[PDB]
Every structure is written in C-alpha cells, then in structure tokens.
Design a protein around this ligand. Structure first.
Ligand SMILES: Nc1ccn([C@@H]2O[C@H](COP(=O)(O)O)[C@@H](O)[C@H]2O)c(=O)n1
Length: 127
C-alpha cells in the first residue's frame, strides 16, 4: 500500500483542521492535512514536508493519533500528532483553516476517511 500521512496539530489547546478545495467530492469538507509518502521517505519526513508545503509551518512529528484508515485498494491513511516548531499556518492549498476545540470536532463536516478519528481527536483535546 501507498501510505498517506496526516497531521493532528494541537496548539494552545486547539486542533488545526483544514478545509479541502479539491476534488469536487471533497471540496468544502474538512481533514487533517498531509499527503502521500514518497519512496525512501520516512513517515516523519513526509508529513513534515507536506505541512511545510501546505501550511507554511515547521512541525515535529510525534506519536500516532488513532488507527490506520483503509482509503482504497491502493492506499492507507495514517495520522500522527504534530507540534509547532516555527511559523503560523495559512491555507496555501486548502479553502480554509480553523482551530477547533473538543466540542467542535464531531460537528465538523469531515471528509469520510478522516471522520474515523473523531473519537481519538476528542480524547486528545479532553482534559
Ligand atoms: N487527511 C487526509 C489527507 C488525504 N487524504 C487522501 O489522501 C490522498 C492524497 O492527499 P492529498 O490529496 O491531500 O495530496 C487523497 O486521495 C485524499 O483523498 C485523506 O483521505 N485524508
């Protein structure tokens, strides 16, 4: 399987979520930002690269957040906790970003794959 990595960036007690702009089926729906691992890259390399490109931030990649998600035949989607090293996130590829708290998680219009992590994200923001 091709691995797609995604980041749960928690800062000052809130989670960053990113509103996709493409393709039509997902445009307007919310995700943890990330992207495909390239051959030879570690998950950490890939996720840090994607978030630098997508958000303009330097992050440190930490523990897994939740379980793998079967995207399709070809792909598996993995989330990791990430934390900010430098920069402020801006939507270079996305329609919008938002900082959300625990009680906003389950009401967001998630992209279908990522919705699996809702309980994990609520827990990560709870307490
Ligand atoms: N949080 C994410 C990030 C990506 N993806 C999927 O991973 C693939 C590659 O991600 P990008 O489209 O963001 O490059 C896409 O097919 C997208 O549907 C996802 O389902 N959830």
């Amino acid at each position: 399987k091709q691995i797609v990595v995604a980041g749960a960036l928690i800062s000052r007690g809130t989670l960053l979520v990113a509103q996709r702009d493409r393709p039509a089926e997902l445009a307007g729906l919310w995700e943890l930002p990330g992207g495909k691992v390239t051959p030879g890259e570690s998950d950490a390399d890939a996720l840090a690269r994607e978030l630098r490109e997508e958000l303009g931030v330097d992050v440190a990649v930490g523990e897994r957040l939740g379980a793998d998600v079967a995207l399709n035949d070809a792909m598996t989607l993995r989330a990791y906790r990430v934390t900010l090293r430098s920069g402020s996130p801006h939507p270079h590829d996305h329609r919008a970003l938002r900082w959300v708290g625990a009680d906003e998680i389950d009401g967001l219009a998630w992209v279908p794959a990522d919705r699996a992590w809702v309980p994990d994200l609520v827990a990560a923001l709870s307490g």
